[PDB]
Amino acid sequence: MQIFVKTLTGKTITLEVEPSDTIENVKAKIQDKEGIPPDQQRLIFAGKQLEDGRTLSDYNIQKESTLHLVLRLRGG
Structure with missing residues (x-):
């Protein structure tokens, strides 16, 4: 999807x-395109920050859903 x-x-x-x-997993796929390691990424759907171990299905993320990406940089 x-x-x-x-x-x-x-x-x-x-x-x-x-x-x-x-x-x-999604963060790992994002690193392939963007270079950022997973542990500097935070993903967001429908206003909410998403947890590493949940699946897309768990959040109602489906075909053509839009997530947002913000960076978390220890001291950055």
């Missing part, structure tokens, strides 16, 4: 994912 991940600084990328993918 295709989803979109939007940063807050203006970038949209596209991903093919599974509904069973964990948020951590």
Whole structure:
């Protein structure tokens, strides 16, 4: 299923994912496109920050859903 991940600084990328993918999986896929390691990423859906071990299915993220990406930088 295709989803979109939007940063807050203006970038949209596209991903093919599974509904069973964990948020951590999604972060790993994002690193492939964006370079950022998973542990500097936080993902958001429908106003909410998402937890690493939940699946997309758990959050009602489906085909063509849009997530947002923010960075978490220890002292950054």
